[PDB]
Amino acid sequence: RCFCQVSGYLDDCTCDVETIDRFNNYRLFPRLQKLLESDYFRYYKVNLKRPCPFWNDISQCCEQAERLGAVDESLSEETQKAVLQWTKHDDSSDNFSPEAEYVDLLLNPERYTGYKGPDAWKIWNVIYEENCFKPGLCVEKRAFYRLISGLHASINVHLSARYLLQETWLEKKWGHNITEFQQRFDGILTEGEGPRRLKNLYFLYLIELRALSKVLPFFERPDFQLFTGNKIQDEENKMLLLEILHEIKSFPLHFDENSFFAGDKKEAHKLKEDFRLHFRNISRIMDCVGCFKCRLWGKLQTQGLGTALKILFSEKLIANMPESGPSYEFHLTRQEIVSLFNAFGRISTSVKELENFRNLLQ
């Protein structure tokens, strides 16, 4: 049995890795991955064109890095129709020119982009700088650190496992680059920092995994619908998602009643609000990122994380779920939902990746 303590003071999870490795890598993976190619999930809405609101740049750019960081914006004629049906259908419900257009994630896997050096380092510094809570002055929450660190790790993991290994003037080979993984993660080479960083990825992973288990209800109500064009998979996909959320629930994970997601009024609230606040800044930050694929996955993976927390805060709010009625109390836009499973999906992939790495490193 796993066990997570998120009091805010010292936050951590005592939990066997083989347990998660085994669970995630074999129980969950092929099916989630299946779901993430589902029509409903390959297409994410995003405004990639907002300008940086904290400084200027584009100075210097390297030429191939803009070539790697460029989002393939492509979209089939049919899909083009298909999104309106969504906008439309989606309009007629809970709904509190957006140069946000839908992007195809399968056309845009997260891998090595050549994004590096000062421009990246700055963004990271600024993201971590956002760790700042009322316990009115800043306190750092360890949770935030570990969350963000886990995310950063998942990424450096993806770029590691999905590196552009060879670029003949003809052919391009993408794959696992051990030396990178190792330079960035090996315990010795990093004086134990990498392992920590990996322990942090897992933290994140579990958080999102809990966030999923605690959100199962919202999908259980048969007025909820993964609306796309057809109805068959819309239901096939519906049960899919569900048996996944069911699997997540199966996983023996427990939290200390101490967790600052407990509704101690103002504390829980202030905190929740401190959070949603911080992630908005973060999203804003992504608007200062020139690796457009990086920027995309940034937005995505963070919205997802915010959403996860949103759930993790709405313990109660969800516990009184209109089992037949439509959920006014709590809600999730398509945008958020896509981001939720997707964010979880890259962390889920990252975890998988670590195993490949173990296996190659033998």
**Which residue positions form the known binding site for FAD?**
111, 113, 124, 149, 152, 184, 197
Closest residue by Cα to residue 75 from 50, 46, 97: 46
Contact 344, 206 (CB under 8 A): no
In whole angstroms, give the CA distance from residue 263 to residue 329.
Answer: 16
The token pair at 197 is 């960083």
Write each residue from 298 to 327 as x if it is in contact with ligand FAD (CB under 6 A), else as -, in one continuous string: x-----------------------------
Among 3, 9, 54, 124, which residue sits at the site for ligand FAD (rule: CB under 6 A)?
124
Q: Is 157 a residue that touches ligand FAD (CB under 6 A)?
A: no
The region of 39-47, 153-161, 213-221, 224-232 touching ligand FAD under the rule CB under 6 A is 153-161
Q: Is 103 a residue that touches ligand FAD (CB under 6 A)?
A: no
List all residues 6 or more positions away from 172 whose beta carbon is below 8 Å from its beta carbon.
164, 166
- Comparison of 271 and 291: residue with beta carbon closer to ligand FAD: 291
Q: State which H helix or E strand residue 114 sits in.
A: none
Instruction: Return the residues of window 242-271 that contact ligand FAD according to CB under 6 A.
Output: none
- Sign of the Cα pseudo-torsion (10, 16, 19, 21, in order): positive
In whole angstroms, give the CA distance from residue 71 to residue 48.
Answer: 9
Among 45, 141, 142, 197, which residue sits at the site for ligand FAD (rule: CB under 6 A)?
197
In whole angstroms, give the CA distance from residue 31 to residue 48.
Answer: 29
Number of residues that bind ligand FAD (CB under 6 A): 21
Q: Is 112 a residue that touches ligand FAD (CB under 6 A)?
A: yes
End-to-end CA gap in the chain: 28
- As measured in angstroms, the least distance from the Cβ of 109 to ligand FAD is 9
In whole angstroms, give the CA distance from residue 254 to residue 3.
Answer: 5
- As measured in angstroms, the least distance from the Cβ of 195 to ligand FAD is 11
- As measured in angstroms, the least distance from the Cβ of 242 to ligand FAD is 31
- As measured in angstroms, the least distance from the Cβ of 225 to ligand FAD is 32
- Kind of pairing between the strands at 253-255 and 2-5: parallel
- As measured in angstroms, the least distance from the Cβ of 184 to ligand FAD is 6
Sites of contact with ligand FAD (CB under 6 A): 110, 112-113, 115-116, 120-121, 123-124, 149, 152-153, 155-156, 159, 197, 289, 293-294, 297-298
